[PDB]
Amino acid sequence: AGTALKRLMAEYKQLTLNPPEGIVAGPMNEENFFEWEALIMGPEDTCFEFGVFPAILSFPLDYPLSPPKMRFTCEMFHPNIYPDGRVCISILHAPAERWSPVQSVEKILLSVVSMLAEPNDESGANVDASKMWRDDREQFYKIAKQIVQKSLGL
Amino acid sequence: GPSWARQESLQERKQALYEYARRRFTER
C-alpha cells in the first residue's frame, strides 16, 4: 500500500463509520480504491429534494496531493455541472477554497450537496441552467423536479 | 467485516437510499 491507498482506505472507513446525511460513498470495488461511486440525495426542502444522484470520483496516483475528478452519471440541470456530468467546483481545482491538505472526500461531497441546496453563480458550466437560475427561478424549480423524477426512474 | 461484506453493505445502503427517497418523493 502506498500513501494514496492508505489515505483512501482511512477516508472510506471514516465515511462508513460516520456517514453524512443522504450520502452513500465508497470505492466501487475494494480491489481498486482509486474509483469511487457516491450517491448523493438532494436535501429535503430544497429544489432537488429526494433526488438520488450517482457520481464517479476518480482519484490521482498522488492523492491527497492532488484532487480527484468527479462526474455525475445521471442527468443533471445545474449551473456548476457540465452537460456531460463533470462537476465544476473550486474544491476540485488545484491551488474560493481550492484543493489543499485540509480537504477530503467528505468535504467534496458536502460541497456538492451544498451547491445542490443553493445553486451558485461564478462558474457557468451549464449556461442555460445559470441563466434560468438567475432569471426564471420558478422554471428552474420545475426542471429540478423533473431531474429528481428521472434520478428515481419515476 | 471483510471486503465482501463491506461491499454488500455498501450496495445495500445504496438500494436503501433509493427506496427511502422514492417513498419521500411520492408521499403525502
Numbering used by the authors:
A (entry chain A): 2 to 96, 107 to 165
B (entry chain B): 377 to 404
Task: Give the article text.
Here, we characterize a key role for the UBE2G2 Binding Region (G2BR) of the ERAD accessory protein ancient ubiquitous protein 1 (AUP1) in ERAD pathways. This 27-amino acid (aa) region of AUP1 binds with high specificity and low nanomolar affinity to the backside of the ERAD ubiquitin-conjugating enzyme (E2) UBE2G2. The G2BRAUP1 shares significant structural conservation with the G2BR found in the E3 ubiquitin ligase gp78 and in vitro can similarly allosterically activate ubiquitination in conjunction with ERAD E3s. Thus, by binding to the backside of a critical ERAD E2, G2BRAUP1 plays multiple critical roles in ERAD.
The structure of the AUP1 G2BR (G2BRAUP1) in complex with UBE2G2 reveals an interface that includes a network of salt bridges, hydrogen bonds, and hydrophobic interactions essential for AUP1 function in cells. The UBE2G2:G2BRAUP1 structure reveals UBE2G2 residues 2 to 96 and 107 to 165, G2BRAUP1 residues 377 to 404, and 158 oxygen atoms of water molecules. Residue 1 and residues 97 to 106 of the extended loop characteristic of UBE2G1 and UBE2G2, as well as yeast Ubc7p, are disordered without observable electron density. The overall structure exhibits a high degree of similarity to the previously described structure of UBE2G2:G2BRgp78 with a root–mean–square deviation (RMSD) of 0.5 Å for 167 out of 182 pairs of Cα atoms. The high degree of similarity of the UBE2G2:G2BRAUP1 and UBE2G2:G2BRgp78 structures is the result of a largely conserved set of G2BR residues involved in direct contacts with UBE2G2. Specifically, five positively charged or polar residues of the G2BRAUP1—R382, Q383, K390, R398, and R400—form salt bridges or hydrogen bonds with negatively charged or polar groups on UBE2G2. Mutation of all five of the positively charged or polar G2BRAUP1 residues to glutamate (5E), however, led to a loss of detectable UBE2G2 binding. While the Y394D mutation alone reduced binding, mutation of L386 and Y394 together eliminated detectable binding to UBE2G2. Binding was similarly lost with a single point mutation, A397D, which makes multiple hydrophobic contacts with UBE2G2. The low nanomolar affinity of G2BRAUP1 for UBE2G2 is driven by a combination of salt bridges, hydrogen bonds, and hydrophobic interactions distributed along the length of the UBE2G2:G2BRAUP1 interface as revealed by the crystal structure.
